[PDB]
Amino acid sequence: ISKEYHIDEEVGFALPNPQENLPDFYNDWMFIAKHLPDLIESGQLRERVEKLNMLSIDHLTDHKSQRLARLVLGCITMAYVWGKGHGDVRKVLPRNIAVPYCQLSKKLELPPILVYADCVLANWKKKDPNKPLTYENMDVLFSFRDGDCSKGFFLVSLLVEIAAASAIKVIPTVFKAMQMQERDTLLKALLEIASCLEKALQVFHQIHDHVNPKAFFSVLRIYLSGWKGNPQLSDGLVYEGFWEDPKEFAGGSAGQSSVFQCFDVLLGIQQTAGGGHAAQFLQDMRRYMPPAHRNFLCSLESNPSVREFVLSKGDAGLREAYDACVKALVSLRSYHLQIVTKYILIPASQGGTDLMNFLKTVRSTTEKSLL
Ligand code: HEM
Numbered sequence: 369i370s371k372e373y374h375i376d377e378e379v380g381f382a383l384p385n386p387q388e389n390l391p392d393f394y395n396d397w398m399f400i401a402k403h404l405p406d407l408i409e410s411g412q413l414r415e416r417v418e419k420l421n422m423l424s425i426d427h428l429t430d431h432k433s434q435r436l437a438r439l440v441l442g443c444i445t446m447a448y449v450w451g452k453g454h455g456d457v458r459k460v461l462p463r464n465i466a467v468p469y470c471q472l473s474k475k476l477e478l479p480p481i482l483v484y485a486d487c488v489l490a491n492w493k494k495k496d497p498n499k500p501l502t503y504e505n506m507d508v509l510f511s512f513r514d515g516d517c518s519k520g521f522f523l524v525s526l527l528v529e530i531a532a533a534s535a536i537k538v539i540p541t542v543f544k545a546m547q548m549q550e551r552d553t554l555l556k557a558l559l560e561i562a563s564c565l566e567k568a569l570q571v572f573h574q575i576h577d578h579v580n581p582k583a584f585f586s587v588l589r590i591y592l593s594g595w596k597g598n599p600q601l602s603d604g605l606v607y608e609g610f611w612e613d614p615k616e617f618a619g620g621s622a623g624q625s626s627v628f629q630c631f632d633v634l635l636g637i638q639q640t641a642g643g644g645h646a647a648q649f650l651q652d653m654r655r656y657m658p659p660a661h662r663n664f665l666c667s668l669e670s671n672p673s674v675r676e677f678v679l680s681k682g683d684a685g686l687r688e689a690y691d692a693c694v695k696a697l698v699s700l701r702s703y704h705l706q707i708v709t710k711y712i713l714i715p716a717s718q719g720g721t722d723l724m725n726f727l728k729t730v731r732s733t734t735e736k737s738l739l
């Protein structure tokens with residue numbers, strides 16, 4: 369019962385059935401994007417980017433073409449800026465790609481950098497459209513290097529977003545039940561949300577079968593990095609012919625995901641409060657979500673607190689149903705921390721401490737919401 373927040377009841381915040389091809393006015397863009405592994409390895413990518421003609425965004429008509437093109441030029445920008453991923457950076461992004469990229473990003477109210485809604489939510493397809501949404505029947509649209517495990521990283525994350533869609537559709541009835549004062553309906557709605565969050569934990573387990581720790585840490589993580597607070601581009605990136613000053617934009621982060629923020633909001637977990645670093649980062653990352661999903665989070669915050677409603681009723685059954693979702697959220701973030709230890713902390717030993725303190729802070733705040 370959500371209206372124009374661009375939430376799908378099957379795939380949630382993910383883009384349903386993303387477009388795979390752009391108009392023929394843009395083959396020059398997509399030939400580069402489709403061959404990023406070979407163009408980067410051979411050292412040809414940067415020159416092809418500098419060889420491109422400046423195209424107009426006026427031939428991108430519908431919303432899906434605008435999102436796919438945003439994914440196409442976002443991966444090209446990452447490839448051009450980071451190159452072969454070994455430290456030799458580009459600090460200027462050529463005008464014939466920088467101007468249409470920023471023009472399209474202002475059109476979609478997104479920053480001109482690859483974000484979570486680009487390479488996870490809009491970077492997928494079904495192998496055969498009549499078989500279900502499972503890893504074996506899905507594939508990504510774009511990757512950076514052969515063996516970067518971008519498919520495993522993006523698809524498993526996407527599958528977690530799909531598993532969360534089952535709990536998102538319950539949100540309108542949680543709020544309807546509190547307003548209409550229906551305790552029994554509220555209890556069932558909370559237990560249904562807890563069940564869906566418990567089952568999303570099992571989807572997290574698939575990351576061990578499709579992502580390699582060395583490939584993720586030494587390759588994939590490099591291409592998703594940004595230029596805010598980064599010593600490699602200490603002043604940001606120069607977007608040619610759009611700004612004359614260098615601009616800083618944060619690297620891709622799953623803090624840009626709306627799924628875990630929307631359940632923090634729904635359950636009254638004030639992840640955005642307290643003035644700490646973690647609360648600061650999660651609020652800023654809302655600028656990197658699609659505006660419709662930004663608006664969905666805002667309206668969720670406007671509704672009455674589910675936590676304070678449950679606390680004020682002296683109802684043990686309602687409290688335990690609320691605690692089941694909070695526990696399910698804690699379990700997701702605890703298992704996720706174990707993944708970070710395996711895929712970042714240990715590879716980095718063979719920087720990583722500030723990341724785990726952020727995730728520990730976010731999990732600790734979730735845990736202290738227990739009633
Ligand atoms: C190899 C696998 C993974 C690694 C190494 C990893 C690592 C990280 C790191 C370093 C952060 C903090 C910096 C940032 O936000 O980008 C983070 C945040 C986050 N990641 Fe992942 N992650 C992995 C898989 C996943 C998956 C499959 C999901 C499913 C949605 C996910 C969801 C999140 C969320 C929601 C956050 C925000 C923090 C929070 O809400 O608690 N991660 N992850």
Ligand SMILES: N#Cc1ccc(NC(=S)NCc2cnc3scc(C#CC4CC4)n23)cc1
Pocket residue numbers: 482483484487488521522525589592619620621622623712719720723
């Ligand atoms: N050293 C070090 C180190 C420092 C920071 C990071 N942060 C990363 S890769 N954040 C993205 C992320 C985190 N979790 C998940 S699930 C799906 C995605 C995605 C995506 C595309 C980028 C938008 N993500 C990793 C390593």
